[PDB]
Amino acid sequence: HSDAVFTDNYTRLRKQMAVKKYLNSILN
Amino acid sequence: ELDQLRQEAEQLKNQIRDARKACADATLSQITNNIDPVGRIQMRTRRTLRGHLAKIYAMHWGTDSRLLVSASQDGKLIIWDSYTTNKVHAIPLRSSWVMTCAYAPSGNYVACGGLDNICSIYNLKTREGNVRVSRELAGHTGYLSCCRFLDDNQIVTSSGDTTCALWDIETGQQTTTFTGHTGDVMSLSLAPDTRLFVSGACDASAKLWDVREGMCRQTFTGHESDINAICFFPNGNAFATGSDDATCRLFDLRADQELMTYSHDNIICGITSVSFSKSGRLLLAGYDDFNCNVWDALKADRAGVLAGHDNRVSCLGVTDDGMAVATGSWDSFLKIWN
Amino acid sequence: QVQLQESGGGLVQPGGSLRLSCAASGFTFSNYKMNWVRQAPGKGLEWVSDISQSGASISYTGSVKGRFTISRDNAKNTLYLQMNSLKPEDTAVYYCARCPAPFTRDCFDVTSTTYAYRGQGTQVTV
Amino acid sequence: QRNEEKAQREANKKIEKQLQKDKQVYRATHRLLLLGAGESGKNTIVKQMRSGIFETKFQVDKVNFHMFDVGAQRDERRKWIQCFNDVTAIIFVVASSSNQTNRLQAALKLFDSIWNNKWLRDTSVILFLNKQDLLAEKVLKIEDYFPEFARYTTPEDATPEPGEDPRVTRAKYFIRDEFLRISTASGDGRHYCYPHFTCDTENIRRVFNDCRDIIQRMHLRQYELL
Amino acid sequence: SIAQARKLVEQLKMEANIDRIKVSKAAADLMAYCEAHAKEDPLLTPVPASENPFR
Amino acid sequence: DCIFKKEQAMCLEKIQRANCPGMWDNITCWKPAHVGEMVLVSCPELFRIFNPDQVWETETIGESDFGDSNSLDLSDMGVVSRNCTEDGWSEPFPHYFDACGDQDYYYLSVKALYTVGYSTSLVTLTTAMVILCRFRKLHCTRNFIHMNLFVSFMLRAISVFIKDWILYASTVECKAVMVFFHYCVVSNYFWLFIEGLYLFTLLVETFFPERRYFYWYTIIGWGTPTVCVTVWATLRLYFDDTGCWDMNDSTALWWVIKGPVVGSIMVNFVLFIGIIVILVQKLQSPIYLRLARSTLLLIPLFGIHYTVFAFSPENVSKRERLVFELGLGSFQGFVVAVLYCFLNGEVQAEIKRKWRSW
């Protein structure tokens, strides 16, 4: 259903941004 | 020669009319204007009884003011206990169409009938147990309209063929054939003393009969449309009735006159039933507008409305003790007021 | 009490014209639909014509269509019916008939025998 | 007292239990009113399907149907007709052959009266043009009773059976159109009119199909989908 | 036939030879009955729930 | 403190036990080696989660094994190099540390959109429930199979709100709220199909339409969600339990839930086609405007708008599909309640009758 598609995509984006921010802050 | 018979009949009718209007001086409203009118009376549903399949059509209280019986177009007849909101008996009728019900003064017998022209008598207190038919009464050509018990042995009946009868249930024979109406006789009632009874028919008229002698004593023709329901005053000197012309009227047997008329500007429907309280100072009636209205009998003004139904009210009654009111309707629910 | 009266009958030669009248009292005339019913000798009752409470809607039986004319005037609670070009089989007793209930469009039992709201009739011969 | 109170409660439970079973049967069964003139061939049609009101019980494809005939009831019917407000469908029988009276005109007036009644508006009517074969043989005058017949013509959508004379088709379609007009004049309530021609044991299937349409049109109307 | 006419005339005469009382006495009797039972009309005067069988 | 720091530092003990001593860099973990040799180590998938299995990455290591066994993403195993001098690790000069391995605004906008939709639908639905409950006379098989649907929508909206709060604003409560959210969504999707089935049975079975059918209807409407969500949770427990199960992960695991949601909608579409063909006949017997209105009324009650995307894979058209399927779909509760409870039915007539009497 649509709701699952949203929760999944949003959580994937949230994790992607968390890890990207961590890597950018710590590496550089 | 028919012409001379018509002439003498119409001149005798004129004699009746001019005598009747010469015997009157003033209306009941004019003399009763002095008293203090009753304040608006609030009425509430103290319980609702359910179980009928569809379109209850008749009911009648018992003298004990606790038990009552009712029937519906499904062919079921139910006996209720008002104080405990329970049902105690159920009768499957041999005919699916019903038109009336009656409750014996002593509670030993219950009767009903319908379009089959047959009036059935039921003995509630049978020694064999359960409940069984005591006798079946037949002989009317038209459909049975309404019936009542003078006592536990005599039952009076009316039918849609201008014939009204008194039956001795022990004999099962039509002991007397009251005749004289032009059209279908709709409803009837018995006086408190059981010495006289009246019946309304589809002739815009009502007639008074003698139980013993059998002839008609006098007739009232106040209404302009067919008489649908009729009821007696708590004493035998007066009676009231309603018609499909959207009016209710009160008549006095001794005065032989129309005493009062009940009408409103915002009503365009007929009346199905009428009744009186113990004191006779409160008159109740049902209308096709899915609600019942109550009038101050001695003042001719509305005092309340019973709008607890959503379908045509088909029957109404008041307890002999004057403690509560009940109302059946064309929906499967009936309401009890107090 | 409900009562009705009618008049205007008599002998009319074939091809002539005649007018029927009906009067009423004791009830609200404007609120009841009305009808005309006839009874030929040795024959049952037959419907003739009818009109609405306000006289707007109108109808006739096919036999007298185009020939008969009906009218009403609530101001004096009378009913009128006009007939013309009479022929022998038009002879019958004509009854002024009221419909049973007011404020309704249907009219049951108007042609039925023993109907209590019909007049004594009027005789017409050709 | 507690004992009599418990006895009354268990009696009420018993009666409710013995009532429900009847309730289901009553709901599943469909009641049909049979109406028409006394001499309109009612006997032949009731013989096809098979004390005041006469009743007949018959079965068709697991659907229970009850037909009630007016029978011995008095000619005046303005009162007891209102009692039948809950019938599933009214089956109307009229003889198209039309004598002591203008039978067809009286039938038309009765149909109009039952059509325009404020209580009966919730019930539909099924119309059968009985004695069609007798009408055909006798015609082989409608002009005097219906002057319009001198100019009416058979509609282009008619489907006469082979061997039928054009005059018979014209007459039957004119008689059907009269009733159709007098019925569609109002078209205000749930009521409908389903005319049919008959002479015909197949009429049972015809009534069964009409009854299915009447119940369908009702449920759709309740949802307001039509 | 005129048997119906005979019955109608007979019944109408039988009704006509009967008398009646004044309306004022009927009104007085109705008023007296009303005052004789107004004190025992539960539907008119509200009654307490402590004794009302429906409560 | 930062959990990501601990997650990346978990390799500290793993290299200390092995111990150019191994050094833990913030980006990758390095094993010990000799002096004056070039070392190649792999890089993890945790930073490559932006493209998980969509793109492949080379692993040129000569030999690496440590019970590596299962790997969620075999392709996303990049290789990073660093030189070991006499002073230890040098900087990864040849850019190999990077060689291996608007949307937020849109997601927030659709979040707000379906939040307002659910709120308004909830308000309208509770008003409809209150105004419908009071009249005992109106209640019937229909009004019931309507109250049940309204309660299912209640549960859906409430669970969506609770999930949104409790999650966005590895505890067990997130698992429970996820299971409840799935349960209510599946319940609503089945209840739509049950409504369509009931209408189809009613129109076809004109005679004897109800024979304890409604009792059977409640069981299929509520029972099938319970079993399906419970088996989904059970299987998920057997499989990976990472996070709060928000990710669909394996397509097989998500098939158990997804299959009913496509079967019910397809059967509902077939039933709608049957209804349309049946009504067409009634309309023809001696109409375009009538047919248009009836079809328009049926689509909110039968949730047909889901069909236009129920067939496509979820990944494709994630921008145009989702918005239509969720943001506008959230108003389905508001629309059906207004169209049937207030605009149609005998609820409006009874309210007018009561108001004048009051």
PDB file of C-alpha atoms in Angstrom, chain F residues 181-292:
ATOM      1  CA  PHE F 181      -0.416   0.222  11.624  1.00  0.00           C
ATOM      2  CA  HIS F 182      -0.179  -2.683   9.183  1.00  0.00           C
ATOM      3  CA  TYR F 183      -3.195  -4.306  10.849  1.00  0.00           C
ATOM      4  CA  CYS F 184      -5.423  -1.243  10.507  1.00  0.00           C
ATOM      5  CA  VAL F 185      -4.348  -0.503   6.917  1.00  0.00           C
ATOM      6  CA  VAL F 186      -5.032  -4.103   5.874  1.00  0.00           C
ATOM      7  CA  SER F 187      -8.352  -3.944   7.730  1.00  0.00           C
ATOM      8  CA  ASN F 188      -9.441  -0.859   5.781  1.00  0.00           C
ATOM      9  CA  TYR F 189      -8.352  -2.367   2.463  1.00  0.00           C
ATOM     10  CA  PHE F 190     -10.309  -5.552   3.171  1.00  0.00           C
ATOM     11  CA  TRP F 191     -13.358  -3.635   4.424  1.00  0.00           C
ATOM     12  CA  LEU F 192     -13.582  -1.765   1.116  1.00  0.00           C
ATOM     13  CA  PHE F 193     -13.656  -5.116  -0.694  1.00  0.00           C
ATOM     14  CA  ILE F 194     -16.243  -6.447   1.759  1.00  0.00           C
ATOM     15  CA  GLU F 195     -18.465  -3.433   1.076  1.00  0.00           C
ATOM     16  CA  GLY F 196     -18.229  -4.122  -2.647  1.00  0.00           C
ATOM     17  CA  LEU F 197     -18.903  -7.825  -2.098  1.00  0.00           C
ATOM     18  CA  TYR F 198     -21.971  -7.017  -0.005  1.00  0.00           C
ATOM     19  CA  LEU F 199     -23.365  -4.715  -2.690  1.00  0.00           C
ATOM     20  CA  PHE F 200     -22.733  -7.325  -5.396  1.00  0.00           C
ATOM     21  CA  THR F 201     -24.424 -10.033  -3.323  1.00  0.00           C
ATOM     22  CA  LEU F 202     -27.366  -7.694  -2.572  1.00  0.00           C
ATOM     23  CA  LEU F 203     -28.014  -6.792  -6.263  1.00  0.00           C
ATOM     24  CA  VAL F 204     -27.536 -10.414  -7.502  1.00  0.00           C
ATOM     25  CA  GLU F 205     -29.310 -12.140  -4.577  1.00  0.00           C
ATOM     26  CA  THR F 206     -32.496 -10.122  -4.742  1.00  0.00           C
ATOM     27  CA  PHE F 207     -34.426 -12.927  -3.017  1.00  0.00           C
ATOM     28  CA  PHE F 208     -33.341 -13.961   0.516  1.00  0.00           C
ATOM     29  CA  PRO F 209     -30.443 -11.451   0.427  1.00  0.00           C
ATOM     30  CA  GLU F 210     -29.345 -11.739   4.074  1.00  0.00           C
ATOM     31  CA  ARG F 211     -28.821 -15.153   5.703  1.00  0.00           C
ATOM     32  CA  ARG F 212     -26.398 -14.300   8.543  1.00  0.00           C
ATOM     33  CA  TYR F 213     -24.167 -12.816   5.828  1.00  0.00           C
ATOM     34  CA  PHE F 214     -23.264  -9.752   7.940  1.00  0.00           C
ATOM     35  CA  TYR F 215     -21.841 -11.927  10.767  1.00  0.00           C
ATOM     36  CA  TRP F 216     -19.744 -13.696   8.098  1.00  0.00           C
ATOM     37  CA  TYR F 217     -18.773 -10.245   6.731  1.00  0.00           C
ATOM     38  CA  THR F 218     -17.320  -9.035  10.067  1.00  0.00           C
ATOM     39  CA  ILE F 219     -15.126 -12.146  10.348  1.00  0.00           C
ATOM     40  CA  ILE F 220     -13.566 -11.677   6.879  1.00  0.00           C
ATOM     41  CA  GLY F 221     -13.163  -7.901   7.388  1.00  0.00           C
ATOM     42  CA  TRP F 222     -11.327  -8.072  10.762  1.00  0.00           C
ATOM     43  CA  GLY F 223     -10.085 -11.691  10.981  1.00  0.00           C
ATOM     44  CA  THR F 224      -8.075 -11.882   7.733  1.00  0.00           C
ATOM     45  CA  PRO F 225      -5.981  -8.757   8.709  1.00  0.00           C
ATOM     46  CA  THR F 226      -5.212 -10.301  12.133  1.00  0.00           C
ATOM     47  CA  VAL F 227      -3.870 -13.576  10.715  1.00  0.00           C
ATOM     48  CA  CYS F 228      -1.914 -11.937   7.893  1.00  0.00           C
ATOM     49  CA  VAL F 229      -0.221  -9.330  10.096  1.00  0.00           C
ATOM     50  CA  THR F 230       0.551 -11.927  12.781  1.00  0.00           C
ATOM     51  CA  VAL F 231       2.199 -14.282  10.281  1.00  0.00           C
ATOM     52  CA  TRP F 232       4.069 -11.311   8.783  1.00  0.00           C
ATOM     53  CA  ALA F 233       5.377 -10.353  12.229  1.00  0.00           C
ATOM     54  CA  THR F 234       6.324 -13.959  13.005  1.00  0.00           C
ATOM     55  CA  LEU F 235       8.278 -14.414   9.776  1.00  0.00           C
ATOM     56  CA  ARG F 236       9.904 -11.008  10.255  1.00  0.00           C
ATOM     57  CA  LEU F 237      11.021 -12.090  13.724  1.00  0.00           C
ATOM     58  CA  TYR F 238      12.622 -15.203  12.252  1.00  0.00           C
ATOM     59  CA  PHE F 239      14.379 -13.049   9.638  1.00  0.00           C
ATOM     60  CA  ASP F 240      16.439  -9.885  10.196  1.00  0.00           C
ATOM     61  CA  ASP F 241      15.140  -7.690  13.030  1.00  0.00           C
ATOM     62  CA  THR F 242      17.176  -4.587  12.146  1.00  0.00           C
ATOM     63  CA  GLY F 243      15.715  -1.190  12.992  1.00  0.00           C
ATOM     64  CA  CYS F 244      11.938  -1.185  13.426  1.00  0.00           C
ATOM     65  CA  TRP F 245      11.088  -3.222  10.282  1.00  0.00           C
ATOM     66  CA  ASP F 246      10.315  -0.015   8.372  1.00  0.00           C
ATOM     67  CA  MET F 247      12.442  -1.187   5.445  1.00  0.00           C
ATOM     68  CA  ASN F 248      10.720  -3.692   3.182  1.00  0.00           C
ATOM     69  CA  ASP F 249      14.087  -5.510   2.763  1.00  0.00           C
ATOM     70  CA  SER F 250      13.471  -8.819   0.925  1.00  0.00           C
ATOM     71  CA  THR F 251      10.615  -8.711  -1.577  1.00  0.00           C
ATOM     72  CA  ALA F 252       9.512 -12.176  -0.424  1.00  0.00           C
ATOM     73  CA  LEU F 253       8.864 -10.940   3.113  1.00  0.00           C
ATOM     74  CA  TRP F 254       6.775  -8.021   1.829  1.00  0.00           C
ATOM     75  CA  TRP F 255       4.809 -10.244  -0.574  1.00  0.00           C
ATOM     76  CA  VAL F 256       2.701 -11.755   2.222  1.00  0.00           C
ATOM     77  CA  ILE F 257       1.231  -8.340   3.059  1.00  0.00           C
ATOM     78  CA  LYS F 258       1.306  -6.944  -0.496  1.00  0.00           C
ATOM     79  CA  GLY F 259      -0.605  -9.821  -2.121  1.00  0.00           C
ATOM     80  CA  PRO F 260      -3.903  -9.270  -0.310  1.00  0.00           C
ATOM     81  CA  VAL F 261      -3.751  -5.528  -1.006  1.00  0.00           C
ATOM     82  CA  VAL F 262      -3.642  -6.211  -4.765  1.00  0.00           C
ATOM     83  CA  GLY F 263      -6.081  -9.117  -4.746  1.00  0.00           C
ATOM     84  CA  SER F 264      -8.781  -7.247  -2.850  1.00  0.00           C
ATOM     85  CA  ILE F 265      -8.504  -4.191  -5.104  1.00  0.00           C
ATOM     86  CA  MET F 266      -8.567  -6.265  -8.306  1.00  0.00           C
ATOM     87  CA  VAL F 267     -11.619  -8.234  -7.150  1.00  0.00           C
ATOM     88  CA  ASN F 268     -13.241  -4.927  -6.168  1.00  0.00           C
ATOM     89  CA  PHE F 269     -12.573  -3.597  -9.674  1.00  0.00           C
ATOM     90  CA  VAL F 270     -14.137  -6.718 -11.207  1.00  0.00           C
ATOM     91  CA  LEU F 271     -17.182  -6.330  -8.947  1.00  0.00           C
ATOM     92  CA  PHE F 272     -17.429  -2.653  -9.914  1.00  0.00           C
ATOM     93  CA  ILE F 273     -17.404  -3.649 -13.592  1.00  0.00           C
ATOM     94  CA  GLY F 274     -20.187  -6.133 -12.863  1.00  0.00           C
ATOM     95  CA  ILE F 275     -22.202  -3.440 -11.098  1.00  0.00           C
ATOM     96  CA  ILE F 276     -21.679  -1.053 -14.018  1.00  0.00           C
ATOM     97  CA  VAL F 277     -22.819  -3.590 -16.620  1.00  0.00           C
ATOM     98  CA  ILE F 278     -25.869  -4.554 -14.475  1.00  0.00           C
ATOM     99  CA  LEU F 279     -26.916  -0.886 -13.951  1.00  0.00           C
ATOM    100  CA  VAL F 280     -26.413  -0.244 -17.722  1.00  0.00           C
ATOM    101  CA  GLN F 281     -29.198  -2.778 -18.479  1.00  0.00           C
ATOM    102  CA  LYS F 282     -31.621  -1.134 -15.981  1.00  0.00           C
ATOM    103  CA  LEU F 283     -30.730   2.272 -17.547  1.00  0.00           C
ATOM    104  CA  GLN F 284     -31.254   1.030 -21.150  1.00  0.00           C
ATOM    105  CA  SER F 285     -34.725  -0.613 -20.868  1.00  0.00           C
ATOM    106  CA  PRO F 286     -36.989   2.252 -22.182  1.00  0.00           C
ATOM    107  CA  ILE F 287     -28.562   8.093 -19.665  1.00  0.00           C
ATOM    108  CA  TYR F 288     -24.937   9.261 -19.889  1.00  0.00           C
ATOM    109  CA  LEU F 289     -25.412  11.851 -17.134  1.00  0.00           C
ATOM    110  CA  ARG F 290     -27.017   9.246 -14.870  1.00  0.00           C
ATOM    111  CA  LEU F 291     -24.246   6.722 -15.522  1.00  0.00           C
ATOM    112  CA  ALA F 292     -21.592   9.390 -14.838  1.00  0.00           C
TER     113      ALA F 292
END
